[PDB]
Amino acid sequence: SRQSSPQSGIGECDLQRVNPLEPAHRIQHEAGYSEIWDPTSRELQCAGIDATRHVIENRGLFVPSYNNAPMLIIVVQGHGILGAVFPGCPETFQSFHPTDQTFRDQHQKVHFIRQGDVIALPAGIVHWAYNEATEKLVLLVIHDLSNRENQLDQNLRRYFLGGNQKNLLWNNVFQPLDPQFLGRASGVNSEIIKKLQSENDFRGYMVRVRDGLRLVRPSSEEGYEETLCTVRIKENLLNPERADIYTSRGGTVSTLNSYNLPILRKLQLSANREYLYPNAMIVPEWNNNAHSISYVTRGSGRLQVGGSSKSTVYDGDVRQGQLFIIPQNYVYLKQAGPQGLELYTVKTNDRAKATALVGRTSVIRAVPLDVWINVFQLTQDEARSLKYNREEITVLDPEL
Amino acid sequence: SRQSSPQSGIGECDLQRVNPLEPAHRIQHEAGYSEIWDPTSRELQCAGIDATRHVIENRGLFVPSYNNAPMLIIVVQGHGILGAVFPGCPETFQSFHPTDQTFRDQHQKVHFIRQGDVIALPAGIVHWAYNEATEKLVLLVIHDLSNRENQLDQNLRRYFLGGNQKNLLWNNVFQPLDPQFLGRASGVNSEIIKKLQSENDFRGYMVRVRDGLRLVRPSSEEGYEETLCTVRIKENLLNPERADIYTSRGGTVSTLNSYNLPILRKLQLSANREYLYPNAMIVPEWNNNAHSISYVTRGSGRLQVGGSSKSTVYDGDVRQGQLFIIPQNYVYLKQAGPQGLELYTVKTNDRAKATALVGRTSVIRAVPLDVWINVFQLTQDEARSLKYNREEITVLDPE
Amino acid sequence: SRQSSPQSGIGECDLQRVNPLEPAHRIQHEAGYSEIWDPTSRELQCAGIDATRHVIENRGLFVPSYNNAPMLIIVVQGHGILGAVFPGCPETFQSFHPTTFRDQHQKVHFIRQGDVIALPAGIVHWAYNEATEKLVLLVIHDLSNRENQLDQNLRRYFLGGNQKNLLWNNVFQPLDPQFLGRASGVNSEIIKKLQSENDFRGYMVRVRDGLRLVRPSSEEGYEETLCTVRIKENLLNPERADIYTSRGGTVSTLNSYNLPILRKLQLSANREYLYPNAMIVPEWNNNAHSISYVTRGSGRLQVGGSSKSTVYDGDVRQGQLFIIPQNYVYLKQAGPQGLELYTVKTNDRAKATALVGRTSVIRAVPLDVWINVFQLTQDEARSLKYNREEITVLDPE
Amino acid sequence: SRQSSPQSGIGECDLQRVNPLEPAHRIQHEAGYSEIWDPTSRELQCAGIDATRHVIENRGLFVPSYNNAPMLIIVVQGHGILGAVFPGCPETFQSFHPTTFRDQHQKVHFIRQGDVIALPAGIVHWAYNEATEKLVLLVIHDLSNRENQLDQNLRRYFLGGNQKNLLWNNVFQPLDPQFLGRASGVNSEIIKKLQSENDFRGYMVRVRDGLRLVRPSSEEGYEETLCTVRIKENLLNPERADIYTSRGGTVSTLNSYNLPILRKLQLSANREYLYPNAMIVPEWNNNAHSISYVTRGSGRLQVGGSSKSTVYDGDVRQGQLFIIPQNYVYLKQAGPQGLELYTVKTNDRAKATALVGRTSVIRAVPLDVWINVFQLTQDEARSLKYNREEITVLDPEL
Amino acid sequence: SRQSSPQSGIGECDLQRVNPLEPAHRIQHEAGYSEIWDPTSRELQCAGIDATRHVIENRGLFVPSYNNAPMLIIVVQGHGILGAVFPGCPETFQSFHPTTFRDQHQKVHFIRQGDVIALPAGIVHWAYNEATEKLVLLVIHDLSNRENQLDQNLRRYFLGGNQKNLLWNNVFQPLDPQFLGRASGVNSEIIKKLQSENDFRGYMVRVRDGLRLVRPSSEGYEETLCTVRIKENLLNPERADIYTSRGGTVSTLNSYNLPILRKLQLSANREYLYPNAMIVPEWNNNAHSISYVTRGSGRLQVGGSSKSTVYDGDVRQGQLFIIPQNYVYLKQAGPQGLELYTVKTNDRAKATALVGRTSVIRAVPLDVWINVFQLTQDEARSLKYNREEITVLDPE
Ligand SMILES: O=C(O)Cc1c[nH]c2ccccc12
């Protein structure tokens, strides 16, 4: 129901330690593989999320599926096509030729995805993906299990329209049905339905399309179908020109919330891309209204996290390919190593905001100097230095 | 609190089986009876609902009560009068005559209910019902326990203003109170209060009104009181003319959501009525954003449900009087038997939507042909058959 | 996550007993103390709240902190200053002389007895007692609030402080002073002072010569809107009454039609003042739990629940907290000194349903329903409707 | 544009007189007629409305059309079929047999006396009368609505029709038949039929053989939500009453707490039924103009405005329209045959303020204010507050 | 005030004719020029809009200004940098070296051909051309918008500038320099530079060796409301929302795409038609349409309230045309195709089709049209079904 809770330490988010995490299981398909982070880790259970890394080979088709939880998809590498189906919307990508005959077809709009895209999809919505590039298409999918859109319980379901094998709730939805019953409903013979059920077809859930996928797509140009049915699903965060915060020699923050992408308001999710130059820092801070789930796409650095105890919750490296969860209100500091550091972060609220302890937007600045003089037993000059020594907002220059 | 959960990889809604459910327990009153579905069934626990079927006889008055959860009430049979009390609104049903005398009275608006009506009531609202007719008035009540309006825990409370019993949380709220204390508050003798407590009453919670209930109701015509206090509480779904989908020879769907009945937006519920002619079907589909709770009011059919396992969750018949629950995102197929099939369904969201696997609105059409060719290993002809063979939306013609 | 439940059919709110509660644990600081109600009590876990009574001595400073749950704060006694920081807003209380009165900071709030202050989760707040009498704050944290995505336990995360299972901590302590120093651009020895290790004054510190801040003197863009949100309203003046019955008393309600921030927080409050022997009509809360604190006097409280047996029937008095869950019927009568209560309710626009008086459910139902249900005569059923002509506050005559 | 104003204090609503009005022009069609109230009357200009009475005879089809202003349609008499088209919604009334009963189209609505129907600007609608008695539609268009970005004049754009300054036109006529034919994929002589070349039936045509529609038979995605929006509600049954005073009569209110589309449209309505000699309490509309149509009976209406002299004190009777602007005080009493009124108000959640009865402003103000303002005794002031125990509808024998 | 009306049965939008329009006036600057469409034209007064085309030369800086009306800006050609200031937001583009490379300013936006930028009334904005080719901005100001509480005329208030009936002014000129200097803490000689009264470069100035900005390069509320996206690019055929092979595309821009459009009550689209392709005949059900032809040409027919066509003729590159709410229209591309950018005066503006799968013809029962138009049943089926496209028609 709407009223759920995780499987399970005075409480499920009273974590004494957090660690960067790697995937715990790999599923092979014909045309790629899926790596799953352990859904039972305390970090993931506290954050209410699942995390998956799909790796789709060249000419690989990821079988359409729907989930019980909304998600953000980060395109980590590659480029391709994503489909998303809005039920009751007309098919507006149309070709009435020929009369390669598979070019005669009508379907819903398809989306051209590329590295740096963050794609937002509701629960219940069918989606699929196809890699048209030579390099692998790598999708990092964060499913928000605790979202109001999931009325089941705090476990991910993946319901596929097709597929078969080459504790997970992952299934071809046509399999548990009577093919004759489904056949009569669809107006097709039950042997067509047996092909939907994928009997004797063990390619997994990403299949190779040998000669390339044929679809209706716009060529070079050298009612509600216009509004609701056209909702923007993604935005690219990769261009440094898309930065919202920029400190020269320090790096960028590129935020993605419902002031940018409208569907995020319904989904109650946000994201960001942070790029740090070598040795640069993000100001120490906490998330005031959200958990943060970060994936390191490039580089490395040091992360320190503080919680409820006098002892540190984590103090160590993060590096490429790792995920890390920072719960709401835990304090954290990041510094890039010598190669820089690039992260994408999903946050469990729309309009997720952080509170800084350093810089022009700091809580230290906002409090009277004499409060800090008394609390910290500082002199006036020591407390001024605390307020004003860093003049940056959010992104710290390693050279100050 | 707001943060609750039921009694129940594995999860409370990870169901490998569902079955049609009949009531598990009957409570007999003087002027009718109440049948309760087992609240501990896995289906009900997952969907976060209770279900009750109240049968109110001729000249039967169902004692006023309030609950901790909002509800939809389906009028399965009969007709009668329903009261619902909005606190802080004035009494706008008014008679100043005479000077028999109980006709001199003021009370809030009463509602004239009939078969096919679906009535929506928030948590905490006092309501009551009466049957004027000779046929029984049958109300199917679906309480949404996981609703935000319920801050207590995932169990139904029934708090009656009167009544007496001769674990269910069903109680006459006056009984625990000190009658002297309540009488001093109310300005009445503590013996009137002991009549409110009804400690020696054997009639239960539906009482006979031998000579018929008298109230202030409009006669033949042959400020905030106009707006908030007037909120509409019901809509009738029975007329085929109220259909939103109609397929000749197949049947109708009549949907009830917040574009139809404004109070549903606040309650986060919606409802529909499906009528299938013999052997007709509703397209195979799943609910995107809600659980479904269906009650068979006439006829019979076959239902198949799929879930997360390669094996079916249910494949069998459904029959008049049975309740069945389909959780969010489970796929289901329905076909009417040889007498047709009528269902009313409550869904656990505002503007609940289904996604079809067949027909013009199908997800199959929406996806490029070549994806299906590749995924299912179909020919181009077979893929096109799959897209276009059924030209219906939602309700399938058996011919 | 967003989907949680307390450590608590036998639901967490199926309470066969309630009773008025006093705090169970006290924490001593240099400049006052903190009294905590037992967070494990069935009543508190049902209501989804934590309750704290902070007592701040003269010249005492309550170290800044933030929590995982929104709160209402009732100023039971005294007066003082309250800070609340909105991240990303500029410092608009400014002094540029001399060139610690040279400072810029956020707007500070002047608080006094009768104020109800509303703060979201995650916001840094602090408080200072200006007056000679103790400043007494009753804080109700709403743990089950949507703003709390962690679990159903309060975190108090302090910016400073140290000792003079609770999740109460100086957030600087678990960070590396050299790492935090580099980010802050200060020496690590300054960071060690933030960590307060060697400083054991607790979380309320004495300010010998009085706190110096930027405050407005006598006058004898987004900074103007979002950043200037109202955070409190005073409920004490009988003139702020919304319901008044002469010889009876007042109810002074605080909801989002009064204080806008309450809409986002999903909380409201009220102050009830009853003259000796007066009553609030019997009723139930139709969309909220109520958490009441008795600030003055005493009275009788009866609560009814799901059983034939009363859930409570007895005295309430000064200093006690009582919880009435959603839908439970209750009646209150003031004793011979009167009765003052402040109450917090777990909803935006919390509403009660009356069983007595001009807004009663009894009036709204047809007379012949009550005739038949209760086996009353017509005169008796009219008595029941009409004998009390008051709304909400009953006149002891 | 959005920023408009009428052709014509003394501002446009500083009205020294209001009168009940009758229609000023009749347009004859083949299969009925349309009666139009004078759009230049000061009352209609003030209220920002256009009022039309359409009379559709048996087997009369009112040609589909759309307007630049939203409307409330009151079914004064008869019953029939109404269609409204939501663009981009699928056709969910479907018949696949035989292999003009084989058709798909959008939902059609079965309309009857007492129905109030709400339609936005720009939506195509049409109606058909299958019954013996004439189908009588009173259409109130809200010209000043935000939905109308043109100017303060109604347009009536028909998809068909031709004559049997009003802006009333068959929209196909100003198009080039070759160009339109190419676009539609039909021969340009089919297009000439669309232009209703040589067809002079007006805008209600007779259906010689009766209309063949796909309509639900007896039962003895977005298409389910947005595309299903409720367009109407019946107000006629005394059981639907929101306010009832025995021997006095009823008020049945229609606003966005009842019919959700009204929120978007910023309109509301009500039906008032008064037994002989009964009254509606004197009052004013605090946030809307009122546009009332008398469907049955007769009565006395008095209106007060900004001057010492009454704005109107006189009879109203069946078939008359009367406009009461925002904040003008009014009182109504039924005649010896009772009085039935349907009223449109220019706001979502239109409310009135009562000078008499339990909801009155008199009750809300301290007694001593009225003692001092009116120079009454304490007893006279209590009489004023309390002599009428009714809310809104007054008992002629209280 | 909020209650206004344009300068001058009969009504301001009862148009018997519409025409494609070109600018009526050209204002030269040092580093570009501005072309203004006649604001008294019946079409523009009906639609409640002004239209301007600014052409900015290489290394030209368009002086910052603010207006009383919200606008959509179409980047017709070129690329550059646009600034927009949100008052009360912090400067988050920051350089602290050397110790004018050392500066802090608000975010700057990299604009390019195909971008549609949305700006509220009252917001200071400015633009600079990075490239060799001219930067060409087509600006549609929505005068009738609720954001304009003044009256139905555009004001252009510049922070600088001076000449090289329009309400176009350097806001510092009417101020006393001593008084403004005292407030600003600067000498009155700086304020006289602000006033620019002996500067004859106009409102677009040449920046000799490039503008020095803090901008990214080799790779609280400040993160939310201060970040609001102001633009979306419509040029890529892949951004298309409606696509008919051999016909063209429609790429729509409304508040389900770009959140700020909800507050502004505006939307836009780009239409690209292959040679001889059509958009289905239709009307705008809830807005006026203001179309600018960026490429190519075509035939446009418009119908209104009479039996006489309102317009039937060609539209060509560089021309603006207005279709009021509810007027019916048909468009066909000429032999080079047609590209249009359109601004519509509503949030979530929608059109109704007379042809194709979404048509009103399909939604109405067959027998209604059989009776209205005196068609055979086969004719009326042809009328519903002969075009199976939605919105964009295949010329074959
Ligand atoms: O109306 C039609 O003929 C096509 C159409 C419009 N909206 C639709 C949604 C789903 C499937 C088809 C359609």
Ligand SMILES: O=C(O)Cc1c[nH]c2ccccc12
């Ligand atoms: O812009 C500035 O220079 C100051 C400023 C404006 N808004 C702010 C928000 C937080 C901190 C500083 C500022």
